[PDB]
Write a protein that binds this ligand. Structure first.
Ligand code: CA
Ligand code: CA
Ligand code: CA
Ligand code: CA
Ligand code: ZN
Ligand code: ZN
Lengths: 90, 90
């Protein structure tokens, strides 16, 4: 696979690794999303150690209002983080 | 870096690799977009060999109407292709 193709498979992989832990296997619940950020975005995002922060991140991400982050929402999250990095480091 | 972090860096890298070739160093013109898809998405998307296909792809991802693909628009493109790969495997 190319570098881009690899990167895409890696986004699918990490989503599944966290979404399948509990409840809906295809959605991130707040605790799944917290572990994903803390473990996998430890350099791009401040560690989450407060319920209020987990809450705010889900509120921000959850466009369909079911209190979970689905794959489309996770893509949007990936784009906002990646964009932030893009901008920040130039 | 985590696999997710490395993937995000990979998106910014490839984008810069192609956007930097001609004209606007920070946006993809049609020629740069065609070569990105052809070289970097050769295992996920059919090879582009017709002007009308690159025209149509650009029209599709060019949401601000400048005839180029900026990083934000490239991220929506990445999300489209990733989603398709996701579905494909399932
Ligand atoms: Ca879940
Ligand atoms: Ca949701
Ligand atoms: Ca360019
Ligand atoms: Ca545009
Ligand atoms: Zn899935
Ligand atoms: Zn840039």
């Amino acid at each position: 696979m190319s570098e881009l193709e690899k990167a895409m498979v890696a986004l699918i992989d990490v989503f599944h690794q966290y979404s399948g832990r509990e409840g809906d296997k295809h959605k991130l619940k707040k605790s799944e999303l917290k572990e994903l950020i803390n473990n996998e975005l430890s350099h791009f995002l401040e560690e989450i150690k407060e319920q209020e922060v987990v809450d705010k991140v889900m509120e921000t991400l959850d466009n369909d209002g079911d209190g979970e982050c689905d794959f489309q929402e996770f893509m949007a999250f990936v784009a906002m983080v990646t964009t932030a990095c893009h901008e920040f480091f130039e």
